Design a protein around this nucleic acid. Structure first.
Lengths: 81, 25, 217, 87, 206, 96, 120, 129, 97
RNA sequence: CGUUUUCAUUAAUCAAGAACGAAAGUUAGGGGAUCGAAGAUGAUCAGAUACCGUCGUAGUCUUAACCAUAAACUAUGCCGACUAGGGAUCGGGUGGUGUUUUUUUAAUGACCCACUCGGCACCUUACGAGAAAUCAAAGUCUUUGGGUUCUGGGGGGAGUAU
């Protein structure tokens, strides 16, 4: 206060701010590839999906939408990429 | 006097002056 | 004999502080009036006003007198004291004392030529007291003081030669007008003009160089 | 403040606050001047020799004088810790 | 600018950690305190004691820069700090005010309690608020032994401490006295355990 | 901006607004409604000549308990009856 | 009401503050000491001051009275706040938390450690 | 809505300078803020500033040195004839010896001194002292 | 001028609160403005409990209570209950006792 | 609120104009328990066309339509930016080798801790404002300019006459 670096803010002070109120605004959401262990291929599901994304071959479910982040449906395996 | 009882009295004045002026249209 | 207390009075009385630039520089609080009767002895006073204020009492009134007094010599210092007492002579005496305790300095400058011996204010300045706003504008040479008589006398004792004045609010109340103008002349040493941009090495207080000569027995 | 022939007029060039570079007035009685002792080898600090700062009344009244003294003492070398620039 | 040997010695760290100087105040936290270090779960905010020691050496450098040792005023109204400031006044010059502050002591001379100092050290900026408010009328630097929830207005250099105390208050006063007795003093080298016992500064009895 | 437009193309709002607000002035109202020529028993002129009808003694209300000696005058250019004070110690012995 | 004024109380206070030996607990002897060591311009005021000195003796002799110190009280409190018991680390090691251990590891040196696991 | 972006920038700078700060992050960041701050940098009133580029309107962080008393915007950019510069500088500057009335002319954004030297006039933007 | 920042009482964010009636005079006062105290008292007073618990089968059996919430107006609460009149600085307090 | 969805200046404030607008009131049915302008009564009182007691019409309620006023109050236009410290709370979200609910680990909900937007507010200061009361806006104003709408100009007469 009265002297601080507003150009190089600390990462812990930046990981807590709103995604619009950081220094350069950027999304806190991500993508992740999911494989259901019945099939073999993987599909890329958004973290905040909003749709019932079913698998490509067996159309069952991978994520049911919610208020914020999507919920992966308890038989899954996901990697953030 | 209280301002709404002067307001009520004024409405009773205007209701009379509308009546006497209606007799001479 | 004076026999001072409040160590700055002893640095003044032993002669270790000679000018009020040493007090006005280090922002030292002045508690005794003889500190400026010795460091500013050619100071002249002026009683600006005497008015009766009154208090209602369970049988009658209590009328005491309120005196507005301005001191200040002719060379950049003024002070303004206001005091009620039960008697007018005691009120004027105590107003001279409070005006001597409150001596402020004045940054006077030029209208816009750098010629000899400054005559006017360096900046446009403004003081508010109560509702009275008194604004002082720098003026060309030979303007005189374009002001009301009490403001003109407060700026005359200041040593200001040329100034323009505007005022706003109930300027008939003499206390608030004189105090607004006193703020407007004390605020000339707060405006950071670009000739004061050069850094200074922050001198040591005179209370430490003459630490031995203070701190009485 | 000078005049046509070189000469300084306007008595008392004022002091300035080390935390804000603002003019410390004559009627500023919350302003303060802090002398910090210079220390030689194995202590025993060098009497009559200080590093001095001045802080205005506004810096102290806002509660900023501690972080300002941390900053002003760190980048003189009195402290090699407390004040961190990225807040 | 510290030569070699003003570092936080491990014995001083054992003293400061034994007398609980790091156990700061709870979730209450003034924004003017970056002396915190990674708040312990169930409330308590651990104070960085290295920062405490650095501010302590700085404060002892400020105290040992006054020409006279006796226009320093140690202030305590809280009973945890009264014996502390009394033994601080015993060893150094440093005139004490233990207990009632008696306003008017700084401004407006002629009272019998008229101290006119160049430094005021205050054990608690909240319970000694009138001394701090009154020192800002008369241009005095104020040092304060502050916990993390204590107000910072009109204090310059502060020592982050635990003024809930009964151990930290007398210890930080003891360390100020020991450190200002090292600087410009009749004292000894690096190790120098200072035979004057640490716990002479503490609240006695109840 | 607090109450008024400021943009460069807004002089019509400023003109019409001040022209509307001028009517609250007493002087402007009485100078542009022609009070002087219709009301105000002269013609708006400075002096006016008239003929004395009767002499009146007007009692001063509240303070200054006295009988101010006045006359009732009918103006020549209007015919308007007007009470006019006759100032000095005496001077009702001079008007008839 | 037998409330005694500030004359009686301040003179009694000042008599104890400089004559605490000589000033026993008996009224009839303090009545003579206030005749010897003080100059009181009346007999009634002398008896009142002597009675209040005897009263304050009676409540000094069961512990202190706030306000009055003579020589022996301040000498005793002077030789009471010089205390032995000290404190230590002699009772084992320095018991810390996880975070105090992070603190000393982040700044200092090898000090004895014993971490804890307190939670909400 | 946001009607002027210089006005928001200069009020942010004024509040941070009144409150003793040494840094202002200004939300709006136009070209005219860049040239206004360049003139204020040329006459010493601000330190360096740094334009941070997100892929949007942009931000600026200005360093302050305490020399600024007030910077201000004149909100309708009034068409100033070269005889009216003395009227403006008499109106809204503290003295004739310092402070600049900043105005955008077709020969660039500049202070009134360079405007007098280059004999150019135009519209007024603001003022710095 | 304003005598309270919360003018009568406790309406910030509504515009209208439904009124209740004073229990004493039946003056209709808004529910947030009223003055509200819950009277919680036994059906026996502190003298009668001995002679009543003597006079009972099922030993002492409940000491059963009585509950009602009293809404007063500003007039009739001042005239008896919660009044005195607080000074301008003691007005701002909100601790009950 | 969430969002790495879309369009790409579509926006802000607004004479004239329009929708909605407590209570009372009006028109025509329905309903009419309660309270209750008017009215009738019993006391009080010097009188009592009042307060207090009893009875009770219109009204209170509803349907269709008027009326367009309230101390319609936060007596504080709306949009935008900046400036200060705190802890509560409501709605959304993110995090936790945290508690609870056992079935055996889970899972959800409730809670706890930290953060975050968006609300109704509050508390302490005052940098600042103010004639003061007081005000995180009533600040960022004689160092006066972010955009815009409405209103005022001594008290009456008078919100009267037309």
């Amino acid at each position: 206060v009265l002297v601080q670096d507003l150009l190089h803010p600390t990462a812990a002070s930046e990981a807590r701010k709103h995604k619009l109120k950081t220094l350069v605004q950027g999304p806190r959401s991500y993508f992740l590839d999911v494989k259901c262990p019945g099939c073999l291929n993987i599909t890329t599901v958004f973290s905040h999906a909003q749709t019932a994304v079913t698998c490509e071959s067996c159309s069952t479910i991978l994520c049911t939408p919610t208020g914020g982040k999507a919920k992966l449906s308890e038989g899954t395996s996901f990697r953030r990429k | 006097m209280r301002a709404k009882w002067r307001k009520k009295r004024t409405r009773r004045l205007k209701r009379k002056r509308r009546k006497v002026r209606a007799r001479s249209k | 004999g004076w026999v001072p207390v409040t160590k700055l009075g002893r640095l003044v009385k032993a002669g270790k502080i000679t000018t009020i630039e040493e007090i006005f520089l280090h922002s030292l609080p002045v508690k005794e009036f003889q500190i400026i009767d010795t460091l500013l002895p050619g100071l002249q006073d002026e009683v600006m006003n005497i008015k009766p204020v009154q208090k209602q009492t369970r049988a009658g009134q209590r009328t005491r007198f309120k005196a507005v007094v301005v001191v200040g010599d002719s060379n950049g210092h003024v002070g303004l004291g206001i005091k009620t007492a039960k008697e007018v002579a005691g009120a004027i005496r105590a107003g001279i004392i409070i005006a001597k305790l409150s001596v402020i300095p004045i940054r006077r400058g030029y209208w816009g030529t750098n010629l000899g011996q400054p005559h006017s204010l360096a900046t446009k300045t403004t003081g508010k007291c109560g509702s009275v706003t008194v604004r002082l504008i720098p003026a060309p040479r030979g303007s005189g003081i374009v002001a009301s008589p009490a403001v003109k006398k407060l700026l005359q004792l200041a040593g200001v030669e040329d100034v323009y004045t505007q005022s706003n609010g109930k300027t008939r109340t003499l206390e608030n007008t004189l105090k607004a103008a006193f703020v407007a002349i004390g605020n000339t040493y707060g405006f950071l003009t670009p000739n004061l941009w050069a850094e200074q090495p922050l001198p040591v207080s005179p209370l430490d160089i003459y630490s031995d000569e203070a701190s009485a027995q | 403040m000078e005049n046509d022939k070189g000469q300084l007029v306007e008595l008392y060039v004022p002091r300035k606050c080390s935390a804000t570079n603002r003019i410390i007035k004559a009627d500023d009685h919350a302003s303060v001047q802090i002398n910090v002792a210079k220390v030689d080898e194995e202590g025993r600090a060098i009497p009559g020799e200080y590093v001095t700062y001045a802080l205005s009344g506004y810096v102290r009244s806002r509660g900023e004088s501690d972080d300002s003294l941390n900053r002003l003492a760190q980048n003189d070398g009195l402290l090699k810790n407390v004040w961190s620039y990225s807040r | 600018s510290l030569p070699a040997t003003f570092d936080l010695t491990p014995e001083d760290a054992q003293l400061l950690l034994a007398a609980n100087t790091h156990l700061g105040a709870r979730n209450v936290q003034v924004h003017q305190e970056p002396y915190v270090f990674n708040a312990r779960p169930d409330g308590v905010h651990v104070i960085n004691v290295g920062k405490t020691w650095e501010k302590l050496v700085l404060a002892a450098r400020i105290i040992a820069a006054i020409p006279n040792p006796e226009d320093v005023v140690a202030i305590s109204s809280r009973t945890f700090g009264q014996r502390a400031v009394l033994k601080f006044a015993a060893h150094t010059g440093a005139t004490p005010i233990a207990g009632r502050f008696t306003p008017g002591s700084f401004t407006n001379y002629i009272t019998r309690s008229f101290k006119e100092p160049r430094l005021v050290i205050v054990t608690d900026p909240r319970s000694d608020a009138q001394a701090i408010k009154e020192a800002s009328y008369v241009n005095i630097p104020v040092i304060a032994l502050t916990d993390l929830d204590s107000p910072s207005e009109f204090v310059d250099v502060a020592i982050p401490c635990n003024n809930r105390g009964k151990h930290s208050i007398g210890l930080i006063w003891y360390l100020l006295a020991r450190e200002v007795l090292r600087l410009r003093g009749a004292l000894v080298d690096r190790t120098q355990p200072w035979s004057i016992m640490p716990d002479l500064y503490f609240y006695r009895d109840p | 901006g607090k109450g008024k437009p400021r943009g460069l193309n807004s002089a019509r709002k400023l003109r019409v607004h001040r022209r509307n607000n001028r009517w609250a002035e007493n002087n402007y109202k009485k100078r542009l409604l022609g009070t002087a020529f219709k009301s105000s028993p002269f013609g708006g002129s400075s002096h006016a000549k008239g003929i004395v009808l009767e002499k009146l003694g007007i009692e001063s209300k509240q303070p200054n308990s006295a009988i101010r000696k006045c006359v009732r005058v009918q103006l020549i250019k209007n015919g308007k009856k007007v009470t006019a004070f006759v100032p000095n110690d005496g001077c009702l012995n001079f008007v008839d | 009401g037998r409330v005694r004024t500030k004359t009686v109380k301040r003179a009694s206070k000042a008599l104890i503050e400089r004559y605490y030996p000589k000033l026993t607990l008996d009224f009839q002897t303090n009545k003579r000491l206030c005749d010897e060591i003080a100059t009181i311009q009346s007999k009634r005021l002398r008896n009142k001051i002597a009675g209040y000195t005897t009263h304050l003796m009676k409540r000094i002799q069961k512990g202190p009275v706030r306000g009055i110190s003579f020589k022996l009280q301040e000498e005793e409190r002077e030789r009471k706040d010089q205390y032995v018991p000290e404190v230590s680390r002699s009772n084992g090691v320095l018991n810390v938390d996880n975070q105090t251990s992070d603190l000393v590891k982040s700044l200092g040196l090898k000090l004895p450690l014993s971490v804890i696991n307190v939670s909400a | 809505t946001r009607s002027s972006v210089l006005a928001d920038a200069l009020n942010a700078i004024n509040n941070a300078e009144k409150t003793g700060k040494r840094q202002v992050l200004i939300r709006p960041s136009s070209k005219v803020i860049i040239k206004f701050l360049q003139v204020m940098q040329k006459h010493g009133y601000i330190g360096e500033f740094e334009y941070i580029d997100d892929h949007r309107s942009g931000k600026i962080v200005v360093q302050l040195n305490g020399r600024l008393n007030k910077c201000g915007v004149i909100s309708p950019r009034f068409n100033v004839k070269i005889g009216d510069i003395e009227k403006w500088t008499a109106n809204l500057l503290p003295a004739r010896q310092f402070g600049y009335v900043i105005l955008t002319t077709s020969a660039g954004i500049m202070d009134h001194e360079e405007a007098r030297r280059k004999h150019v006039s135009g519209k007024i933007l603001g003022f710095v002292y | 001028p304003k005598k309270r920042a919360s003018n009568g009482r406790n309406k910030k964010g509504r515009g209208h609160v439904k009124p209740v009636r004073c229990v004493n005079c039946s003056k209709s006062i808004p529910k947030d403005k009223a003055i509200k105290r819950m009277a919680i008292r036994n059906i026996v007073e502190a003298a009668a409990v001995r002679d009543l618990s003597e006079a009972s089968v099922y030993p002492e059996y409940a000491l059963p209570k009585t509950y009602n919430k009293l809404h007063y107006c500003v007039s009739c609460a001042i005239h008896a209950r919660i009044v005195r009149v607080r000074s301008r600085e003691d007005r701002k307090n909100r601790a009950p006792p």
